[PDB]
Write a protein that holds these residues in place. Structure first.
Motif, mmCIF file in Angstrom:
data_model
loop_
_atom_site.group_PDB
_atom_site.id
_atom_site.type_symbol
_atom_site.label_atom_id
_atom_site.label_comp_id
_atom_site.label_asym_id
_atom_site.label_seq_id
_atom_site.Cartn_x
_atom_site.Cartn_y
_atom_site.Cartn_z
ATOM 1 N N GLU A 27 0.851 -1.183 0.000
ATOM 2 C CA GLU A 27 0.000 0.000 0.000
ATOM 3 C C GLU A 27 0.888 1.236 0.000
ATOM 4 O O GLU A 27 0.563 2.247 -0.621
ATOM 5 C CB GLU A 27 -0.914 0.017 1.227
ATOM 6 C CG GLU A 27 -2.063 -0.977 1.161
ATOM 7 C CD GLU A 27 -3.068 -0.776 2.278
ATOM 8 O OE1 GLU A 27 -2.691 -0.940 3.457
ATOM 9 O OE2 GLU A 27 -4.236 -0.450 1.976
ATOM 10 N N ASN A 28 2.015 1.141 0.700
ATOM 11 C CA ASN A 28 2.969 2.241 0.775
ATOM 12 C C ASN A 28 3.982 2.101 -0.357
ATOM 13 O O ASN A 28 5.041 1.495 -0.187
ATOM 14 C CB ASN A 28 3.689 2.231 2.126
ATOM 15 C CG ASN A 28 2.747 2.467 3.290
ATOM 16 O OD1 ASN A 28 2.077 3.498 3.362
ATOM 17 N ND2 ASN A 28 2.692 1.512 4.211
ATOM 18 N N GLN A 48 3.865 13.200 -3.848
ATOM 19 C CA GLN A 48 2.651 14.000 -3.949
ATOM 20 C C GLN A 48 2.962 15.491 -3.888
ATOM 21 O O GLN A 48 3.849 15.921 -3.148
ATOM 22 C CB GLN A 48 1.685 13.628 -2.824
ATOM 23 C CG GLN A 48 0.360 14.367 -2.867
ATOM 24 C CD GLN A 48 -0.553 13.985 -1.720
ATOM 25 O OE1 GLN A 48 -0.912 12.818 -1.559
ATOM 26 N NE2 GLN A 48 -0.935 14.970 -0.914
ATOM 27 N N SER A 72 0.636 9.750 2.378
ATOM 28 C CA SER A 72 -0.207 8.714 2.957
ATOM 29 C C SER A 72 -1.637 8.938 2.473
ATOM 30 O O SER A 72 -2.006 10.056 2.111
ATOM 31 C CB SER A 72 -0.156 8.775 4.486
ATOM 32 O OG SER A 72 -0.591 10.036 4.963
ATOM 33 N N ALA A 73 -2.436 7.877 2.461
ATOM 34 C CA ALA A 73 -3.821 7.964 2.010
ATOM 35 C C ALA A 73 -4.614 9.029 2.766
ATOM 36 O O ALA A 73 -4.810 8.927 3.976
ATOM 37 C CB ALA A 73 -4.501 6.609 2.155
ATOM 38 N N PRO A 74 -5.076 10.071 2.053
ATOM 39 C CA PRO A 74 -5.854 11.161 2.652
ATOM 40 C C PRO A 74 -7.144 10.638 3.279
ATOM 41 O O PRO A 74 -7.773 9.727 2.742
ATOM 42 C CB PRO A 74 -6.125 12.082 1.465
ATOM 43 C CG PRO A 74 -4.923 11.867 0.596
ATOM 44 C CD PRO A 74 -4.769 10.368 0.643
ATOM 45 N N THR A 75 -7.540 11.215 4.409
ATOM 46 C CA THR A 75 -8.755 10.784 5.091
ATOM 47 C C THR A 75 -9.848 11.847 5.061
ATOM 48 O O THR A 75 -9.616 12.985 4.651
ATOM 49 C CB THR A 75 -8.467 10.410 6.561
ATOM 50 O OG1 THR A 75 -9.653 9.874 7.161
ATOM 51 C CG2 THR A 75 -8.021 11.636 7.344
#
Lengths: 257, 192, 239, 202, 95, 37, 37, 60, 66
Positions: free
Chosen positions: I33-34, I39, I54-57
Motif C-alpha cells: 500500500e505504501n 505528492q 499517505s492515504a488522505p482521510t
RNA sequence: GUUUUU
RNA sequence: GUUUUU
RNA sequence: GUUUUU
RNA sequence: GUUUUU
RNA sequence: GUUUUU
C-alpha cells in the motif's frame, strides 16, 4: 523524465553515429528482479505475510499430482479422510438372565464414545477440534440360540431424556427412535440417528448428543440346557461428521454459554 | 530488445524453479551452436549405451559367484552419480576366459540369496568357454526406482561355471545400460 | 494356417573361411564395424585447409610436372647422364648432343611414387624442356624420343617423335609420347619409356652482354589419358 | 518374453526422465570451493574470497587461472569426455548489506596462462555496481584454435576481479563482505568424446 | 545418506534457494513426493530432509544485533495416508 | 508400438559344417569373395 | 541422407549349437548343400 | 577384427606426416594362464579427405 | 523473472495437485500500500512537496459544498 | 556427403 | 557381359 | 517335378 | 491353433 | 515410449 530514460538515449545515440560496422554500444534499462512487492500465502486457517519474497523454486519438470499411478496401495484415495467415520465397536455387555423388565443392559456416552480410546479411528481428529456436528448409524447386535427367547429395547435417548430419565414412563420409550427387537427372531438392530440437540453444535468429548441405551423389554427365558451367557454389542458409524472449532490437544473448551 | 537481466545483471535468489535456459549476450556475442558430429554424445541413451569395466573374478571351480552390481565412480559411467534414481534395461557384458567349459549367467534384483540357488529359473544364458556374451537384463526390480548410489543399485549378477576337468580361469565383467531413466539430479561428487 | 509346422529360426550355411578378413577389397573394409559411440559420421572442414573440396583422384597428382633425376649441379658429362639439369652451350656444335638418356617413370619424383605403389599403367607422357636464356640469346634445339628404345646412343631423330625449340619469349617446350607397348597396360617399373635425346640444331648465339651458355630443366608428367591399375608391393622406402 | 516395463516417474516427483546430460553441465557450481575464504587476498583458486574496505582501487581481490575441473559439476564431465566446445558463464555473487556500495571489475583473458595481475581494459570484463541484484555474470565465448577443445587440457584463461571503487560502509554496516564465484556452461555448450578417467570420485 | 560424499557448492543442483540476507526474509520451496518407493513408511525420514546451510557467514556490524533465528515452516500440498495400523505402531511397508 | 519387446539383432541357426568349402558346385565357387580392389 | 551413420555389414546373433547337424527333420536334410557340378 | 575408428580428433585436420598423424591405438590382452603371443596390425581408411598436395618425398 | 512471480507458481502448484477437496494453499503477490510515490499540493501561491505521502482521510459520506 | 553400391 | 540364377 | 513349403 | 509376434 | 534407426 529520467532516470528510467537512458537505455533509449544511449541505445539511440549509439544508433545515430553508427557506420558500416554498426553501433559500438547498446544500453538497456529496466526494473530489478528484486522489486518492491508483498506476498501472502494461506493454508488451512493460516496466513503467511511476507514483504520480502523471493522467486519460488521447484525440481526439474516436476509432477505434483502426488497420485501413485501404480496404486501400490490399492485403496480409495479418500480412505484416510473417511477413516474416522468408519464403523466401530462402541460397547459389549453380557445380559444376565435374572434381570427384570425395564432394567438397563448397557449404555454408551454419545458422542464422546467414538473417541472412547486412543485406538478409535476418530480419536485422532477429535482431539484437534472442540465443536462437533454429526449423524449416527448404530447396529446393536445380540445373538441367542433358537431354544432361548426374550426381547430387548434398543433406544436413542437425547440429553433431554437422559437428564430426566426417571421422570419418564418406561413402555412409552417406544416414542423415541428404537427397535423392540425380539430375540430368536432378530440378531441385529439398525438405528439411523441425525444430529439432535438444542444447540447447533455439541462440545467435543461430551455426552450432550445424548446416549444410546439397551433395556430389558422382557427378561431372557433360557431353557435348562441352553447357554446362559448372552452378549449385547453396540456398533457405531458416522453417517456424517463435522469438526469445526480449533483447539489445543484434547483441551476442554466451552462452546456453550 | 535485450533486457539488463540477459546482460549479466541478475539475482541468485530468483533462480527457482530449477532449469532456466536464460540467454546471455553482449554486443559482439551470441550463443552459437556448432555441431561436429551427426549426433549428440551428451544424450543419456548414447553415452551410457557404451559399456565400461566393472570387475573380474578368477574361478578355480564351479562355485557360484554373486556380486552386487552398482554404478561406477570410475569410468565415464560416473556421470550417473549426478542423478539419484534410475530405471530401465541393463546390459551386462561377460567374458569367459577358460579352456574347456561353460558359464551360467543370471541376473536378479531380488536381495534374497536363496532365490539364486536354483539358477535356471532366473535365466542362466550359456557362454561356451572362450566366448563372450552380452545379456540385457530387464527391470525386474521390486522397487520402482533404483537409488543410483546403492552398493546394489543395480541387481545382483550370478556366474556359475560348469567346468569339465582340472581347468580353471577368470571371468571379466563389463556393464552398460540400454535406455536409461534418470531422475532428480543431485550435487556433484567429491574426489578421493 | 502355418501351424502344421513348428515355428523356427532360419537356418543358414556358413561359407568357407568364416572369420577370414579381406584386406584387399575396399567394399569389404568400408563395411567394417564402427567403434563410434553411435556409429556416426563427422562434419569435415575443408576451409581450414584453404580448399573448397577434398581430393578424390590421385591420377591428377601424377599429372603434375617434376624434374627428371634432379641434381644440385648441371650435367658434368655434356648431358649424357640422367640429370634433367644440363647446360646448353655456345661451344656445342649442331648435331652435337646436349642431353641423352633412357627414361623411366621412377626418374620423376611425383611419378616414382606411383611406381612404388601401382604395378601397371597406361597413357601418354609429357616432357617439358625449359631453357632459361636472356632476351638476346637465340637458337634452335631439337629434342626427340624413340619410344621403347634401350640402346643409350646418339642417333638421328628424323624418324623419332621430336620437337624443335626456337628460343623466344616462351622458352618452355613440350613433347608428348603416346602410349606405346605390346600390352594394354604396362609395368610401372619395367621396360624403359624410350630414348630421350636433345640435340643442338643451331648454336646458341649471344653478344657482348649476354651469356654464352644457359641452363635447362626437364620436367615430366602424365597425360590427360593417364591411368594406373594394380597396386603392388614397394621397391623403395621414402622418408 | 523379451518384454519392456512401464516406468514410474511420479515416484521420483518428475513428469519425464532426464535425456540430455549437457543440461547438468549448464548448472552453476562453486569454483575451488573452500570452508574458509581466500587467505591470500584472493590470489588463489578459491572462489570464496573477501572484498574489503581496506583494498585500494586496482588492487586485486581475486586472481587465478581457470580450468573446467575447478567446478564440481564440470569436473565430472572433464573426467568423462575428452573434448568440448561452447561458452562458459561465471557468476560472482557479492553478499553485502543494503548500505554497502561500490564497484568491482572482473575481467577474463581467454586462453591466458601467466597468473599475474594485469590491466583488464582489453580483457572481457564486467563492472559490478552493488545494489539489489548483487550477482554478476560474465560470458566467455569459445576461444581456441581447434573446433573442439580438450576437456582437461589448456586453461580456459586468466580470471581476475580487481577493485574499481572501495567498498563503502557506515557505523552499522560491514567493512568487508563475502563473495562467491560459480561456473556453468553456455546454452551452446557441447561435449564430444568420452575418454578414460583422470580421477576417482566417491 | 551419502552427504559427506557430495561436494558442497554443487548442492545448487537440488531444489534450493540461495537466499541473500538483507534482501529476502523468506524462501519458498515446493517439493513433490520423491523416493525410490511408491510409498514411505509413516514416522520415517525416508522422504529425505530439508536443511539450511551457511552459504556465506553472517557479517554483523558492531552495533547491529547478533541473534538471527532461522525458522522452517511446512505445508502439505497433497497428503495421502493408506495402510491401516494400530495406534502409532512401527509397521514395515518395505521389504 | 513394438516397444513392448526390447529391440534385438536377428538370431539364426548355423547349419552343419559351417566353414566347409564346396569345391564341386560352380554356383558355390562363383560366389566366393573377391581380392579385387 | 543416411550418411550420419557409417555404413556397416549386418550383425546377427548365432543360435545355440551352430554347426549341429539335424538328422531327424527332412526339412533339414533336403536343404543340405549339393556336390552337383 | 576390423574396427573403424571415427574422426574423434580435437584438431580439424591431421597433418598427414606426424608420428601421430593418426590417433593412438591401445591393445591390452586379458590372458588366462602362462599363455603368450604376438599382435600384428594392419591399417586402412574408409573415405579419406586429403588436402593441399605437397612435393613428392625422397628415397632413403 | 522473479521476485514478482510467486503468487502464480504457488497458486498454480497448489492448483495442480488439488484433489476432490480442492487446493490446500493459495498465494497472491502484489505491490505494498505504501509505494514509492511523490505528492504535490498547491494552494494560493503555495506548493507543498511531499515524497512520503499517505492515504488522505475524511469523515463519513461528507459534504464539501460548504 | 552418390562420402557403400545404382 | 543373361559373363550368378530366371 | 507342388519332386522344399503354401 | 493368434498354439512365435501384430 | 520416435524409449533401435528415419
Amino acid at each position: 523524465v529520467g532516470n528510467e530514460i537512458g537505455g533509449n538515449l544511449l541505445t539511440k545515440v549509439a544508433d545515430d553515429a553508427s557506420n558500416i560496422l554498426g553501433p559500438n554500444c547498446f544500453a538497456t534499462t529496466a526494473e530489478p528482479e528484486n522489486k518492491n512487492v508483498v506476498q501472502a500465502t494461506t493454508t488451512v486457517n493460516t496466513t503467511n505475510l511476507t514483504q520480502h519474497p523471493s522467486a519460488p523454486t521447484m525440481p526439474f519438470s516436476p509432477d505434483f499430482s502426488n497420485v501413485d499411478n501404480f496404486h501400490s496401495m490399492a485403496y480409495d484415495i479418500t480412505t484416510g479422510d473417511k477413516n474416522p467415520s468408519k464403523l466401530v465397536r462402541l460397547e459389549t455387555h453380557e445380559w444376565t438372565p435374572s434381570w427384570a423388565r425395564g432394567y438397563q443392559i448397557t449404555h454408551v456416552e454419545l458422542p464422546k464414545v467414538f473417541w472412547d480410546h486412543q485406538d478409535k479411528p476418530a480419536y485422532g481428529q477429535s482431539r484437534y477440534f472442540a465443536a462437533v456436528r454429526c449423524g449416527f448409524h448404530f447396529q446393536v447386535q445380540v445373538n441367542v440360540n433358537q431354544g432361548t427367547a426374550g426381547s430387548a429395547l434398543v433406544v436413542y435417548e437425547p440429553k433431554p431424556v437422559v437428564t430426566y430419565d426417571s421422570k419418564l414412563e418406561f413402555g412409552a420409550f417406544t416414542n423415541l427412535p428404537h427397535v423392540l427387537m425380539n430375540l430368536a427372531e432378530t440378531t441385529q438392530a439398525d438405528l439411523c440417528i441425525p444430529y439432535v440437540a438444542d444447540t447447533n453444535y455439541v462440545k467435543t468429548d461430551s455426552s450432550d448428543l445424548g446416549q444410546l441405551k439397551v433395556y430389558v423389554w422382557t427378561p431372557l427365558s433360557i431353557p435348562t440346557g441352553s447357554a446362559n451367557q448372552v452378549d449385547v454389542t453396540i456398533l457405531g458409524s458416522l453417517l456424517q461428521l463435522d469438526f469445526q472449532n480449533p483447539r489445543v490437544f484434547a483441551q476442554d473448551v466451552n462452546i456453550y454459554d | 530488445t535485450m533486457s539488463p537481466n540477459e546482460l549479466g545483471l541478475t539475482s541468485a535468489q530468483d533462480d527457482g524453479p530449477l532449469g532456466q535456459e536464460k540467454p546471455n549476450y553482449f554486443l559482439n556475442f551470441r550463443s552459437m551452436n556448432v555441431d561436429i558430429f551427426t549426433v549428440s554424445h551428451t544424450k543419456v541413451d548414447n553415452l551410457f549405451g557404451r559399456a565400461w569395466f566393472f570387475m573380474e573374478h578368477t574361478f578355480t571351480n564351479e562355485g557360484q559367484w554373486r556380486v552386487p552390481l552398482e554404478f561406477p565412480k570410475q569410468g565415464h559411467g560416473s556421470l550417473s552419480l549426478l542423478f539419484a534414481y534410475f530405471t530401465g534395461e541393463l546390459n551386462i557384458h561377460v567374458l569367459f576366459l577358460s579352456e574347456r567349459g561353460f558359464l551360467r549367467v543370471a541376473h536378479t534384483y531380488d536381495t534374497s540369496n536363496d532365490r539364486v540357488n536354483f539358477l535356471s529359473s532366473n535365466g542362466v544364458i550359456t557362454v561356451p568357454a572362450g566366448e563372450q556374451m552380452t545379456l540385457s537384463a530387464p527391470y525386474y526390480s521390486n522397487k520402482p526406482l533404483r537409488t543410483v548410489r546403492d552398493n546394489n543399485s543395480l541387481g545382483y549378477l550370478m556366474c556359475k561355471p560348469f567346468l569339465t576337468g582340472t581347468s580353471t580361469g577368470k571371468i571379466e565383467v563389463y556393464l552398460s545400460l540400454r535406455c536409461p531413466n534418470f531422475f532428480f539430479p543431485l550435487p556433484a561428487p567429491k574426489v578421493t | 494356417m502355418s501351424t502344421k509346422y513348428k515355428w523356427t529360426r532360419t537356418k543358414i550355411d556358413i561359407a568357407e573361411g568364416p572369420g577370414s578378413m579381406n584386406m584387399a577389397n575396399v567394399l569389404c573394409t568400408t563395411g567394417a564395424q564402427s567403434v563410434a559411440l553411435v556409429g556416426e559420421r563427422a562434419f569435415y572442414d575443408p576451409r581450414t585447409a584453404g580448399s573448397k573440396s577434398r581430393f578424390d583422384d590421385l591420377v591428377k597428382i601424377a599429372q603434375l610436372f617434376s624434374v627428371m633425376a634432379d641434381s644440385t649441379t648441371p650435367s658434368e658429362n655434356h648431358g649424357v647422364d640422367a640429370k634433367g639439369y644440363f647446360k646448353w652451350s655456345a661451344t656445342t656444335a649442331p648435331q652435337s648432343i646436349v642431353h641423352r638418356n633412357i627414361v623411366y617413370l621412377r626418374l620423376f619424383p611425383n611419378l616414382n611414387v606411383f611406381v612404388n605403389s601401382y604395378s601397371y599403367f597406361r597413357g601418354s607422357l609429357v616432357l617439358r624442356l625449359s631453357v632459361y636464356a636472356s632476351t638476346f640469346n637465340r637458337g634452335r634445339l631439337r629434342m626427340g624420343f624413340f619410344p621403347n628404345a634401350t640402346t643409350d646412343s646418339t642417333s638421328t631423330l628424323d624418324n623419332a617423335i621430336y620437337t624443335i625449340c626456337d628460343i623466344g619469349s616462351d622458352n618452355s617446350f613440350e613433347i608428348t609420347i603416346p602410349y606405346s607397348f605390346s600390352t594394354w597396360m604396362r609395368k610401372t617399373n619395367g621396360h624403359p619409356i624410350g630414348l630421350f635425346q636433345i640435340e643442338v640444331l643451331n648454336r646458341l648465339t649471344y653478344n657482348s652482354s649476354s651469356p654464352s651458355e644457359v641452363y635447362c630443366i626437364v620436367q615430366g608428367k602424365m597425360g590427360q589419358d593417364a591411368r594406373f591399375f594394380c597396386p603392388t608391393g614397394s621397391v623403395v622406402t621414402f622418408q
